[PDB]
């Protein structure tokens, strides 16, 4: 929400200082690019997190137990995607990290606005130029 | 450090509007500095993929029964299986993660020269409201 | 080929000497024509070796399969299913595709070069324009 | 042709000579039509080889696959999964595949050509500005 | 034959440096004829193609069993093999080539329409350096 | 619409009257809108046709899947792999496309048509220079 | 509505010059920039609107075909997920919006014609006044 926030306030154009927005365009070209990349950064974490997870239940669920359990409903391999799937402890990694998925989806379009703003700003220097 | 690289970036495209010629002729060289940045990643990464391909198969000899050096896994994990196990496999792992955190470094770089490019003709329409004052 | 040296080479390539600008936008046409002769010459050297991969590539792939590689034979017994992770990690295979993606990186790094000289001669002109300006 | 006569070629034809500027101009768009004339030519060329090429797969994918080609049969048994890299390092195909991707170095690089051409021309509008000004 | 596009634009991009400002007027004539040749080819390729779809279909009922005449084939192809086995088929070749023969021929003529296009620039250009000495 | 109605309309269009350039130039606005209309209008034709298409296209498929178009059922019993070729062949779905196919070629030739005035423009304004500058 | 001919026409009222009053065509030429200007905003309204509703009724049809439809129609025919793209694209309703949709398009890039048109015209009438200098 503070993503959609942000993007909102900083794509509209002070037509009065057109010099400093053609500048500053690429000033946050960049703000969006530092988020971006860190994100990424941060569902390599989670993604590896989610590696793990899946392996450890994997025993578990197979009968190579996982602590001091074992799952006695016999899971098939025609049942074990359902099974780690819907696992409490697997869901939470999934969760969180389909939600920085969404998190970084948003940044692509944030530089989509941009280097269009940025476009449009040399626009209005054109469209207003035409008077004369 | 993905700090290092943010930061610096950060640095380089804020533009001094009263040594606008100066920029012009530098923000060539700002994308020149940048390649160099990206391809000695891709080398960097290039080596790992060397490590990661060596690391995938010794484990996977390991856990396959074929062993890995003296040591043999009890598990006796099946073909469905065995996506899952190398992936979660802590020799595997750190490679992988070592390998793409360089790639993200790598990704950070691309949108620089898609900051330089643009921040070159950022330049331009500076100079032009201003012949527009005239 | 060594890639610091390249970089050392167009580094040197894109600076401009202000005092000869119409000498510049002259240059700049053989710099163009100068990366885009590497671009290419790295080509002619990534398929021969390509082509090297590719008969490595079947050679290794007899001998893990049973058919053998010479007077030699793999005893590991290896499925079509690992196939594609062993071969990967083959000596000759690594070898080989380590240095084919090694010059496909310089030709990823000449396609950067023309780019930086296919703008660079816009930037000399934009320079040129700030100057009618002060005028 | 060879890549490198074509380097020398677009070596020469992107000098401009600053004492002849109308002419260089001028003749820049013979310059542009002249390389718009190798490209086409070298197309017309990879459209007989890749012809070759689809006929040379044919036989071989019928050799590798039991059916004999000509008077010889692979003993080899070859897989469905194995074939594409059997087929990539055959010598019959190898050689007309690694012909055909080497006017692919020939295309893009007359292509670039065109690129450079095209700019030069503006490269050669670059320098009237300058000159107009010193004037 | 792609040699007399080849020869005919050679002879349209010269530019005639003292007739000027007839030389502007008719590179946009110039544009006209070879926007006709060129659209003319496309027409050209449009039956083909038909033609092409037509030889794919007679013969993949050859390779699959189903006959393409009074015959039938007896080398009883795989689904992966057939991509492969029509494109070297005598009856498809023959068609695609024509197709692509034209294909060049096109890209030739959009080529002469690069070329015609800074043509009339160069006619500019050079006028300007008629100026320049006056 | 015929295609060399196009082509000998637009010749006679992009001819240039000297004696009487300061109507050309005023006129030359006037075209655009001439072969505007027609680019726009081509273009709702192409998308009537288009749906045309649309509805054959499931029409046929249904024929030949098996699900039957109309009293009649394809014995041929086609397969996925085979749709696209077999579709794309069929005698109804070839001559629709075919039409589609055609007006395309009318709108991109007055795309083309459009590239041509728009420079036809600034060519008037270049001969007028040259005048201005012998006077 | 909007009618393509009315657009066209319009346009070609427009974007004739009358000589004798350039300096009023110079002042005439900026506000017809305008008004295309907000007809090509305008048209930007509708296409929103009916593609909303495309992709609504793309998302109920596409139920109803693969079954997860639940009204008083229901798909029988049992299409495969490999058939859907060619089999929604001929249903009566997504032909329909989408014809519509896909016109309004045609209205809009008319528009874009018409502005370049204008842009330029502006610089055309500047030619003409100029072009009498060489008279002068």
Do not use: P
Not at 78 to 107: H, N, P, R
């Amino acid at each position: 929400e503070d993503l959609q926030e942000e993007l909102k306030k900083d794509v509209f154009i002070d037509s009065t200082k057109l010099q400093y927005e053609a500048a500053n365009n690429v000033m946050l070209y960049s703000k969006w690019l530092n988020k971006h990349s860190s994100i990424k950064k941060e569902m390599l974490r989670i993604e590896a997190q989610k590696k793990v997870a899946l392996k450890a239940r994997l025993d578990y669920y197979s009968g190579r137990g996982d602590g001091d359990e074992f799952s006695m409903d016999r899971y098939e391999k025609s049942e074990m995607k359902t099974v780690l799937s819907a696992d409490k402890d697997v869901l939470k990694v999934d969760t969180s990290l389909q939600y920085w998925g969404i998190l970084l989806d948003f940044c692509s379009g944030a530089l989509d606005a941009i280097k269009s703003r940025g476009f449009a700003i040399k626009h209005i220097q054109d469209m207003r130029a035409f008077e004369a």
